[PDB]
Design a binder for this molecule. Structure first.
Ligand code: I6Q
Ligand code: NAG
Ligand code: NAG
Ligand code: NAG
Ligand code: NAG
Ligand code: NAG
Ligand code: NAG
Ligand code: NAG
Ligand code: NAG
Ligand code: NAG
Length: 335
């Protein structure tokens, strides 16, 4: 369509990499909110062909390649070495704004599944504040569904299409490596995981009716996708989810078949140094983990699943563009 720019709310004094990159490439955020409503102005969206997603993907790649410089980067035959200094790392919201002569349409149907027509469409200058959170399996620190859970997918009958489950009630996940230096663990509440997976199962049954829904651990692939992986305070966490995606949904009953304990599920995690880059096909070797207790307290605001007589779903991810899509679904650049 055109070239979108970014307005952040970053502070220049901050040594945090997100703030630095933003203040160099993002303009200041406009204080007054310019929004233009419309009642019957029907319009069509396709989150899966959105170009905003591609632009933000480019900018996030530029961020990570300017901020989390690896000790070594293996791309094909090349091996590039740089300084890999540890750095303060905490995502900051970024808004994507339409330049002059261009608008951003925003679908206001609280149940829009990302494909097709929208009843209530507004006109804005900037998207809401989006946090470029890189993760797999679980979507972290996102915005929730205002009404009920939504199931987004390009083709719900194509096993290959990644399913984005968009929740309406966040679920607390706490991950920590306290004072093996790469051993860490995560805790989630078994009761709230109950409710979340049971309601996701109800919706998934709305879409797949006869068959009984099943949640199973990640089939196979690189460690970065067979586990819930993410960056926390700087370090790369890889966490096991087999005690998380592990239940069955039959006649409105979701029985969780994962190993809980005292009411909380813990996940075993390793802090790996050889990362399989999401930006491009290559590897990145980073410096050994710092000291202190590294801990992140995150919200599970979404899921990435992949289907395969009953229907079974597994944690997926890896195309970091799906993360951006999960937030830019309700937007479209126009004019
Ligand atoms: N080749 C390489 N080195 N990267 C390719 C990317 C692109 C893609 C695409 C599919 C899609 N699948 C469907 C069809 C299949 N062909 C592939 C799966 C995995 C992947 C890979 N993503 C990752 O590696 C990744 O995200 N790492 C990572 C690192 C740090 C953190 Cl914090 C994190 F959270 C994650
Ligand atoms: C969230 O979605 C579920 C399933 O669609 C629904 O039962 C619930 O009432 C919604 N709102 C919540 C949980 O606040
Ligand atoms: C999304 O909703 C549209 C109608 O708005 C429908 O045509 C399409 O099949 C739906 N897709 C999914 C995966 O729910
Ligand atoms: C999804 O793929 C199936 C075949 O795999 C076929 O119905 C069609 O190509 C797609 N359906 C829709 C509604 O786009
Ligand atoms: C919900 O979580 C509680 C917490 O321990 C557990 O007792 C119960 O079995 C869970 N419910 C289901 C359906 O798994
Ligand atoms: C997760 O844990 C199970 C058993 O605890 C193990 O069989 C599986 O290989 C683990 N997966 C990864 C990626 O470590
Ligand atoms: C579910 O959890 C139990 C206990 O942690 C484990 O033995 C079992 O293999 C898990 N299910 C799957 C399908 O991995
Ligand atoms: C979190 O788990 C504890 C037990 O582990 C439970 O008492 C509490 O009710 C859970 N949180 C919510 C919101 O239910
Ligand atoms: C999510 O936000 C909280 C609050 O800023 C932060 O402590 C946590 O590290 C964030 N999680 C991720 C994965 O960025
Ligand atoms: C989780 O979601 C709540 C919802 O209001 C939000 O206020 C909070 O900042 C989010 N993050 C954490 C770490 O609680």
């Amino acid at each position: 369509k055109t070239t979108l720019f970014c307005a952040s709310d970053a502070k220049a004094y901050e040594k945090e990499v997100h703030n630095v990159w933003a203040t160099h490439a993002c303009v200041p955020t406009d204080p007054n909110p310019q929004e233009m409503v419309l009642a019957n102005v029907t319009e069509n969206f396709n989150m899966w062909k959105n170009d905003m997603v591609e632009q933000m993907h480019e900018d996030i790649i530029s961020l990570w390649d300017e901020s989390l410089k690896p000790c070594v980067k293996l791309t094909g035959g090349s091996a590039i070495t740089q300084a890999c200094p540890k750095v303060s790392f905490d995502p900051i919201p970024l808004h994507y704004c339409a330049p002059a002569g261009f608008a951003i349409l925003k679908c206001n149907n609280k149940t829009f599944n990302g494909t097709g027509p929208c009843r209530n469409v507004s006109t804005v200058q900037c998207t809401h504040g989006i946090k470029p959170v890189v993760s797999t399996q679980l979507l972290l620190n996102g915005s929730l569904a205002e009404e009920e859970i939504i199931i987004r997918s390009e083709n719900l009958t194509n096993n290959a299409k990644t399913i984005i489950v968009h929740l309406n009630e966040s679920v607390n996940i706490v991950c920590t490596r306290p004072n093996n230096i790469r051993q860490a663990h995560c805790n989630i509440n078994e009761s709230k995981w109950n409710n979340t997976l049971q309601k996701v199962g109800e919706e998934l049954a709305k879409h797949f009716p006869s068959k009984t829904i099943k949640f199973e651990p990640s089939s196979g692939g690189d460690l970065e996708i067979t586990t819930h992986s993410f960056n926390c305070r700087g370090e790369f966490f890889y966490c096991n989810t087999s005690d998380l995606f592990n239940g069955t949904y039959r006649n409105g009953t979701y029985n969780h078949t994962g190993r809980s304990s005292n009411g909380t599920i813990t996940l075993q995690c390793k802090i790996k140094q050889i990362i399989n880059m999401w930006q491009e096909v290559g590897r990145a070797i980073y410096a050994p983990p710092i000291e202190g207790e590294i801990t992140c307290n995150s919200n599970i605001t979404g899921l990435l699943l992949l289907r395969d007589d009953t229907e079974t779903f597994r944690p997926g991810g890896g195309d970091m563009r799906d993360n951006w899509r999960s937030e830019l679904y309700k937007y479209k650049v126009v004019e």
